[PDB]
Design a protein around this ligand. Structure first.
Ligand SMILES: NC(=O)c1ccc[n+]([C@@H]2O[C@H](COP(=O)([O-])OP(=O)(O)OC[C@H]3O[C@@H](n4cnc5c(N)ncnc54)[C@H](O)[C@@H]3O)[C@@H](O)[C@H]2O)c1
Ligand SMILES: NC(=O)c1ccc[n+]([C@@H]2O[C@H](COP(=O)([O-])OP(=O)(O)OC[C@H]3O[C@@H](n4cnc5c(N)ncnc54)[C@H](O)[C@@H]3O)[C@@H](O)[C@H]2O)c1
Ligand SMILES: [Cl-]
Ligand SMILES: [Cl-]
Ligand SMILES: [Cl-]
Ligand SMILES: [Cl-]
Ligand SMILES: [Zn+2]
Ligand SMILES: [Zn+2]
Lengths: 385, 384
């Protein structure tokens, strides 16, 4: 029926050493001065200087905003926007995971669309008339794929909720997908962000708006990620490079079609508790998959198959169970906590979390139409055994 | 050498103890508080438990809510400026160890301005004046920071936690009220409760231990081991027991010291911003095993009050049983088993171990640790 749109990065560089392309890209574009948007951890760890050392050798000017925090808030966006406005910069370089990537998008959008100074009013299909300030995006987790999506997610601390901004105008001009930038994640962070990448690919494979091209991207991403994540957590170089590619491929799909109830149930955790996005999604994933199983056609057979299960001869019910179990197994293998209680959730908040999840935009993509009671029940199931 | 005890001159205990605050303020003649706290406690309504009572009583207050876990030199300086501009004449610390310690730093520097750099307070701070008076209200069970003479600040430039020790920082009044603590999520109850256990076990076996602190610590171990599972489960009376036990532990350890658990946790906090309670909880049983031969009969006592039938056990057996009872508690309340699980990197172990070797807490440890012993302990705790 309806035609399907795809927004993608016009330019992207892939592989260990891809950040070495940045200075030429800047020179080709004629930009005069960057604002780097990042967090203090990435500065302390030397990750930012991997980029600035190259800029300095090429004679390219920059300034830094390093105030991003996980689950970046309206306060963070306003602070970074002020730094941008006083910096003399003409473009942005986002160095970090989803939290810096998203902050950078917000800054770049508001700078060219000042009617959105309050930040909150960007939620939804932001009616921006101008493209963002140009962004060069450098992910350091594997990851959110925020370098390739048209979305960014802000935490409204005053309202205790996360909100999603969807806007073609925010797409980065160039993405640099370089596992050298990602290797310093602690193993536990690799694990959570990697199962989050898997969640993007699984939810995107089964989302209501799925179509042929996104299905092809998502099923490839699932195969890459499921084959690489244990090795990446273990520190294998090639597995890290595979994770960097797979996490990105997932975004090429889900940006354009949507996610589901895993992300919808994780957003309130981020808002209520400041839970890390990756861990929250990882813990919820297999429970939501079980819930969705009967509403997914043949797709769990494909998921199980590319996660290593010999599905030949299984009934559809068996293949569905096998897909779920393969996710539980991966979570155990890479040390994801088994229960939400383990990561600071309170049972008393489940009613309110569930209403927030029901209302979350990601939930609308879920292949099964969730009810309040389904979400209450899933939180209890995930909370403790 | 005679042994010194510093304690709170005044303290109120039990559910509802914060109800005593407004009268304590009136009796002391203070004019205006600065509340030192964090944004979570404001959001959760915990601060309002206090400020609503103050408002009813006509008592003035302002808030500094910028404390973060593992408070930094930057936080201390920010809060000090807020204090200096607030018109306050006393401090109310509402929170866990992070706000309690920030509050102590503020109150000390306000009356001892030559320590404006913060770092210069490390060790036996040579302050001439008492802190601005502090009324301390813990909201975790917990650090016992309300009753110790210590506070712990993170130097981000030097990537290290440092301990400031000073009789001048003791709070004037502590209010130990489990109603203030009940909102901790279960996982936070678990980690802060095993941290309280750690304080009591390390204090029991520390080099400076003597009769009075031994009596306090073994009672605290009994209380905490008996209550923690129930408190994590939300039982009301268990929460009140935890509030008391965590404080009794501090009555001891403030005055004698801790050991290598705390010494190995400090660099985690500095390197990774690891929560103090979780770090200590994961390390505790491994360090206990390392220390066992240097602990006399005390692991028999620990095992007994943790519910082990030690009658008939050899000392070796009783020691192993104490270690296992701690492993069991950690499983039972959901403490992660390994440091890798909480974001530690193996590549950092050499540097973590040097930092732990040099940490002040390590000097109280009953076994004299070496660099190589600490490296091995990190590796042992890092993964199965
Ligand atoms: N824009 C989108 O389409 C999109 C999609 C998914 C998620 N998100 C958002 O992304 C955010 C989560 O991002 P995330 O999971 O990448 O984590 P993050 O950016 O919040 O980072 C988490 C932590 O890991 C640290 N870290 C990151 N890279 C590191 C490295 N290389 N070395 C050491 N430490 C490193 C950070 O400093 C931080 O402390 C959430 O707010 C989520 O809502 C956005
Ligand atoms: N002698 C001493 O002064 C002493 C002793 C031990 C530890 N410490 C220090 O204490 C700090 C750790 O303190 P902590 O373990 O109490 O944790 P914390 O104060 O760092 O708080 C941890 C988290 O729990 C939240 N929290 C606290 N109370 C809550 C409540 N009632 N409801 C909901 N959330 C709540 C906080 O907002 C914060 O996000 C460390 O920096 C450590 O070095 C000091
Ligand atoms: Cl998200
Ligand atoms: Cl989230
Ligand atoms: Cl401490
Ligand atoms: Cl610590
Ligand atoms: Zn995600
Ligand atoms: Zn402690």
């Amino acid at each position: 029926m309806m035609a399907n749109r795809m927004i993608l990065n016009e330019t992207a560089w892939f592989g260990r050493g891809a950040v070495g392309a940045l200075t030429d890209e800047v020179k080709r574009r004629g930009y005069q001065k960057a604002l780097i948007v990042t967090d203090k951890t990435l500065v302390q760890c030397g990750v930012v200087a991997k980029v600035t050392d190259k800029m300095d050798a090429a004679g390219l000017a920059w300034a830094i905003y390093d105030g991003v925090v996980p689950n970046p808030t309206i306060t963070v966006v306003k602070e970074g926007l002020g730094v941008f406005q006083n910096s003399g910069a003409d473009y942005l370089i986002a160095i970090g995971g989803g939290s810096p990537q998203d902050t950078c998008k917000a800054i770049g959008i508001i700078s060219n669309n000042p009617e959105f100074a309050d930040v909150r009013s960007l939620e939804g299909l932001s009616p921006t008339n101008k493209p963002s300030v140009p962004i060069l995006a450098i992910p350091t987790t594997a990851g959110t794929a925020a370098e390739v999506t048209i979305n960014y997610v802000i935490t409204d601390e005053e309202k205790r909720r996360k909100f999603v901004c969807v806007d073609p105008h925010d797409i980065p001009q160039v993405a640099f997908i370089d596992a050298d930038m990602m290797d310093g994640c602690p193993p536990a962070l690799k694990a959570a962000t990697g199962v989050d990448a898997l969640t993007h690919a699984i939810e995107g494979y089964i989302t209501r708006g799925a179509w042929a091209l996104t299905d092809a991207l998502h099923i490839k991403a699932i195969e890459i990620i499921a084959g690489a994540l244990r090795g990446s957590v273990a520190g294998d170089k090639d597995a890290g490079e595979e994770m960097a590619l797979g996490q990105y491929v997932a975004g090429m799909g889900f940006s354009n079609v949507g996610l589901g109830l895993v992300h919808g149930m994780a957003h309130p955790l981020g808002a209520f508790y400041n839970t890390p996005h990756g861990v929250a999604n990882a813990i919820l994933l297999p429970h939501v998959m079980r819930y969705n199983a009967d509403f997914t056609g043949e797709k769990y057979r494909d998921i199980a198959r590319v996660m290593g299960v010999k599905v030949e001869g299984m009934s559809l019910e068996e293949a569905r169970n096998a897909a779920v179990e393969a996710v539980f197994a991966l979570n155990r293998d890479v040390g994801i906590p088994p229960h939400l209680r383990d990561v600071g959730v309170r049972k008393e908040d489940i009613p309110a979390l569930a209403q927030a999840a029901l209302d979350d935009v990601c939930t609308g993509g879920n292949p099964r139409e969730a009810t309040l009671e389904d979400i209450v029940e899933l939180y209890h199931t995930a909370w403790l055994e």
